[PDB]
Design an enzyme around this catalytic site. Structure first.
Site, PDB file in Angstrom:
ATOM      1  CG  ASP A 299      -1.877  -1.151   1.259  1.00 22.87           C
ATOM      2  OD1 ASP A 299      -2.413  -1.520   0.196  1.00 22.87           O
ATOM      3  OD2 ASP A 299      -2.088  -1.707   2.356  1.00 22.87           O
TER       4      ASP A 299
ATOM      5  CD  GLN B  73       5.234   2.029  -2.826  1.00 19.94           C
ATOM      6  OE1 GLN B  73       4.386   1.142  -2.830  1.00 19.94           O
ATOM      7  NE2 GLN B  73       4.986   3.261  -3.246  1.00 19.94           N
TER       8      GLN B  73
ATOM      9  CB  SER C 198       1.406   6.563   2.883  1.00 19.50           C
ATOM     10  OG  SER C 198       0.411   5.806   3.548  1.00 19.50           O
ATOM     11  NE  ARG C 199      -0.451   2.968  -4.570  1.00 21.01           N
ATOM     12  CZ  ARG C 199       0.848   2.702  -4.575  1.00 21.01           C
ATOM     13  NH1 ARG C 199       1.494   2.395  -3.462  1.00 21.01           N
ATOM     14  NH2 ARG C 199       1.517   2.750  -5.722  1.00 21.01           N
ATOM     15  CB  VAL C 200      -3.502   4.646   4.029  1.00 19.70           C
ATOM     16  CG1 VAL C 200      -4.431   5.050   5.149  1.00 19.70           C
ATOM     17  CG2 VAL C 200      -3.675   3.176   3.704  1.00 19.70           C
TER      18      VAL C 200
END
Lengths: 254, 230, 284, 101, 115, 115
Positions: free
Chosen positions: A93, A95, A118-120
């Site tokens: 999700d 890196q 961070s895709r969250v």
């Protein structure tokens, strides 16, 4: 849960597959090397209250559960286009890229922004930190481009000069000693100091001592505010005014 | 759904993962690999999926597929095979979203091979080419504006700059599913309406309106109404 | 080693391209500042020109060595040049135009000598082997007339004692941002066309101590102002030329990067294919 | 009143309307008043002092220059230095020797 | 790390690493554009880094057959003091060749006089 | 080999080879910074190398169906004399195009008159 050197697990599995004479794929890894890491990492998840209730036969009702995984992958020569690194990049999700050039430079944490993501995003973040971190994000984004102008920044627009001397100070602030984690109150305090322009007159060489002195001062005279911030992480005018008072009172010292 | 006579949209979330799954399956079967390690049946496996997405006399299936480039290498066999079937390309950029323009579609890199006078007609072709040339010219003049300042700009180039800004803000549109964000009702714009609006903006009518009258407005007939109270 | 070094070369070219992109903007700002200085310089020169015109072309007409026409037996130049590289071919164009005129005067058997501003001219004309009588270097930005007082003083000494019969200033002209031209213009004797007036020299100036010494000082200050203005304009032209050269260099780097990337991608695919053929063949 | 200009080849030093000035002429101290007849003189190094409109006092030091007067206009063409020593003839020698060496 | 080597050694090592890292970047500008395009502080950094790079060299008296020169042995304290001195202004005036295969800092001045 | 071909041919060939090698070395700088940055001897090297490259061209009798221009036969004596003259700088006043697709150096100077 932290998996150290998933690349070593991949090497071990490749050895096992080749000793069993299974057909090799790219870079001699077996065909299902992606499946190996994918089914492992997909276990890390947050489950709703109803799954927990069903599993525990109703003994636990109101609680959700979660498992957080921090896999580690070693790039050989800064190559993220290798096989296992590409698979793990595709699975996860987010890196956190650590750079050897930055590590050689003064910034010990060596985390590289602009490439880490961070895709969250902000959902994972407490309210105060979410409020504050956008300033850091934009300050570093602006600072990255001006780094080219740093060589001859003597002849620049004063606005650009301010942006450059702000990005430099933020980058100097982000460095941190090993084994010394900072509570959310302290990170929020130093981030507030950096964002609200209180570091504008502080010298780049002295940022760390300013941070340490501020942390000691707030730990000495204003512990309840830090306790409330650590307990709630909330943000409002009643908190920003208190932080303004903290910083004005500290700035008279040191 | 097509056999019932409707028109259907098929969303593929990653064709690249379809290619990789085919590669993994072929590697498990133990077939000999191909260039850059892909399966030898890559082209036929792609064609089998893509050729079923067509327009039949009963109906049509239309596909929107997310594409991933393995190393930003456009010559890699997977992108090379995929592009041979794509009819149009839509590029989303974070740079445009920074301006608050939504949908964040890049007008200079997005392409369609249907954009031809023999397909969309001469008027649509001319309008699209005009818009593209104006935006390219604006992207050129932004360098001049940054390096030397607005004073360098002639009165004709100031006109194209203002028109390009108005065009670049007219492309914004409120979506019915995004009402929770903008707080404004969504709009549906027919092809002729947007064609006429951009043709008007380029031809110099509506030049007198403020640039903010075009932002998130919808059709031009709503832009003139917004200007009346803006 | 495409897998090892080409990736480093690409990064180096990227960094150089970004640096040149920054230098172009730096030059563009310095050009604006030099333009402001150049525009500031003019009115003092034009006012002194008005006064010298009143004194020369008044009802009573004076005669001065710096003003009167003299036959030519030696010809002199003073040349301005940059102290820093880049800036395209400005210096070489100016030097070859000066050499063309110097050769033209040599063909008539007229001895010539040069006064030099900037190290580039010093080096070029030392390589040519032309007679250089005076040099000044190291002004950089914000050049000062105080440094200029010297070479003009010695060139004046040569001119009025008979050693020199005509004097030219050699410099590039800032026509505008986009265009600059190398030019040569005369300083001594005073080339300015005559003018006529009634108000002046009718309500004539009271002269203290006497009109002649004031005319000498006035002419000397005028030629000094002329050469200072030429120096400033040449500096502005240098900044414009550097901006253009840096744009060209950035475009060249951007063109090189993509070809390097194509070669690197070809090598990347070839290595994977070769190594997988080896692995499959090894499983006999 | 008259409009006083103070300028040099490098820069404009001062510009404004002035009621009276004190300036050191070539042969002696001189005072200028509005409507003064046309006058031309060099000025020795020293202070020139000014009263602007409403008699506000202003002092300017000059290394030298030329003062002149016109109907309604006073212009001071100041220069950077005395220049009377001409030490730069020595500066011209090294330019020659370094070309010979 | 500071817990073992003490803060002095750690700080000296980190300083040397940072200076050499900066020089590695500056050398790319120098190679094409030339050294005049750098800031004067960047020029000073290039100079002192190029000095440190040579100072790290040391003759071994197991290699006299190759070099033809006597080998040198250095204590840790003298190494620390020498690198500290080169990082500061104490030796800005010595040439680059004055440090090459010298040994202790206390004799680089002697080679500079001999150079 | 100087024994078989003799000294003059050998020296001309090696001079041409060295000039072209120097041009190849300069081309990387030329690509980025342009020719203006070069030293005055480097510019002369480039100007001579380009003339040499042009002079190596030759119209073939079998290629008349492609170029149209008639083919040329060039003796060894004429080619060695022409290349030695070009390297000595006798023809530095001619344009590059003068040497393109000319049989011999006299034809090159004849083409120069009409550019």
């Amino acid at each position: 849960i932290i998996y150290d050197d998933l690349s070593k697990q991949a090497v071990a599995y490749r050895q096992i597959s080749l000793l069993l004479r299974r057909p090799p794929g790219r870079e001699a890894f077996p065909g299902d090397v992606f499946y190996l890491h994918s089914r492992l990492l997909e276990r890390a998840a947050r489950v709703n209250a109803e799954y927990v209730e069903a599993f525990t036969k109703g003994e636990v009702k109101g609680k959700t559960g979660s498992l957080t995984a921090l896999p580690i992958i070693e790039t050989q020569a800064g190559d993220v286009s290798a096989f296992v690194p590409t698979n793990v990049i595709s699975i996860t999700d987010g890196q956190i890229f650590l750079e050897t050039n930055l590590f050689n430079a003064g910034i010990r944490p060596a985390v590289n922004p602009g490439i880490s993501v961070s895709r969250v995003g902000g959902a994972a973040q407490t309210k105060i930190m979410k409020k504050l971190s956008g300033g850091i994000r934009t300050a570093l984004a602006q600072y990255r481009e001006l780094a080219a102008f740093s060589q001859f920044a003597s002849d620049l627009d004063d606005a650009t000069r301010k942006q450059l001397d702000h990005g430099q100070k933020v980058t100097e602030l982000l460095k941190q000693k090993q084994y010394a984690p900072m509570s959310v109150a302290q990170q929020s305090l130093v981030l507030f100091a950096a964002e609200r322009g209180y570091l504008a007159d502080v010298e780049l060489s002295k940022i760390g001592s300013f941070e340490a002195a501020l942390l000691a001062y707030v730990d000495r005279d204003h512990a309840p505010l830090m306790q409330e911030i650590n307990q709630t992480g909330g943000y409002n005018d009643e908190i920003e005014g208190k932080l303004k008072g903290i910083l004005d009172s500290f700035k008279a010292t040191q | 759904f097509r056999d019932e006579g409707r028109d259907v949209l098929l969303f593929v979330d990653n064709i690249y993962r379809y290619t990789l799954a085919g590669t993994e399956v072929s590697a498990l079967l133990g077939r000999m690999p191909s260039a850059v390690g892909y399966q030898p049946t890559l082209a036929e496996e792609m064609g089998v999926l893509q050729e079923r997405i067509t327009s039949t006399k009963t109906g049509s299936i239309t596909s929107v597929q997310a594409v991933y480039v393995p190393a930003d290498d456009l010559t890699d066999p997977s992108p090379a095979t995929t592009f041979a079937h794509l009819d149009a390309t839509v590029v989303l950029s974070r740079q445009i979203a920074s301006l608050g323009i939504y949908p964040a579609v890049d007008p200079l890199d997005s392409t369609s091979r249907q954009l031809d006078p023999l397909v969309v007609g001469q008027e649509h072709y001319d309008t699209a080419r005009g818009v593209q040339s104006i935006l390219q010219r604006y992207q050129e003049l932004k360098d001049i504006i940054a390096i030397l300042g607005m004073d360098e700009l002639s009165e004709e180039d100031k006109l194209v700059v203002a028109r390009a800004r108005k065009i670049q803000r007219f492309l914004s549109q409120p979506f019915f599913v995004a009402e929770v964000f903008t707080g404004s009702p969504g709009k549906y714009v027919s092809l002729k309406d947007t064609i006429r609006g951009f043709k008007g903006i380029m031809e110099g009518e509506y030049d007198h309106l403020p640039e903010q009258a075009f932002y998130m407005v919808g059709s031009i007939e709503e832009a003139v109404e917004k200007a009346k109270k803006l | 080693a495409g897998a090892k070094d080409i990736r480093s070369k690409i990064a180096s070219v990227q960094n150089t391209q970004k640096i040149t992109k920054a230098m172009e903007m730096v030059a563009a700002s310095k050009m604006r500042k030099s333009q402001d200085r150049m525009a500031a310089s003019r009115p003092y020169a034009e006012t002194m020109r008005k006064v010298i015109g009143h004194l020369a072309h008044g009802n009573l007409e004076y005669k001065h060595p710096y003003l009167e026409d003299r036959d030519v037996k030696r010809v002199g130049y003073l040349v301005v040049s940059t102290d820093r590289g880049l800036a395209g071919g400005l210096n070489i164009n100016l030097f070859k135009k000066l050499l063309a005129e110097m050769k033209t005067w040599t063909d008539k058997g007229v001895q010539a000598d040069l006064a030099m501003i900037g190290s580039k001219g010093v080096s070029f004309f030392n390589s040519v082997g032309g007679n250089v009588v005076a040099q000044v270097t190291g002004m950089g930005d914000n050049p000062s007339l105080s440094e200029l007082i010297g070479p003009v003083k010695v060139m004046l000494q040569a001119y009025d004692e008979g050693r020199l019969d005509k004097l030219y200033i050699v410099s590039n002209k800032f026509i505008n941002t986009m265009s600059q031209v190398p030019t040569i213009s005369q300083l001594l004797p005073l080339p300015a066309s005559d003018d006529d007036d009634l108000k002046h020299k009718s309500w004539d100036y009271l002269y203290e101590p006497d009109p002649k010494a004031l005319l000498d000082t006035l002419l000397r200050r005028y030629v000094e102002s002329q050469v200072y203005q030429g120096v400033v304009e040449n500096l502005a032209s240098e900044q414009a030329a550097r901006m253009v050269a840096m744009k060209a260099a950035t475009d060249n780097g951007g063109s090189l990067i993509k070809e390097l990337q194509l070669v690197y991608n070809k090598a990347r695919q070839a290595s994977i294919t070769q190594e997988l053929t080896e692995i499959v063949s090894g499983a006999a | 009143t008259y409009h006083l200009d103070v300028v040099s080849a490098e820069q404009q030093m001062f510009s404004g309307l002035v009621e009276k000035i004190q300036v050191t002429g070539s042969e002696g101290e001189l005072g200028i008043y509005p409507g003064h007849a046309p006058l031309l003189t060099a000025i020795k190094p020293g202070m020139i002092r000014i009263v602007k409109q409403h008699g506000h006092e202003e002092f300017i030091y000059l290394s030298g220059g030329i003062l002149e007067v016109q109907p309604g206009n006073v212009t001071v063409l100041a220069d950077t230095a005395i220049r009377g020593q001409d030490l730069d003839e020595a500066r011209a020698m090294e330019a020659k020797r370094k070309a010979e060496e």
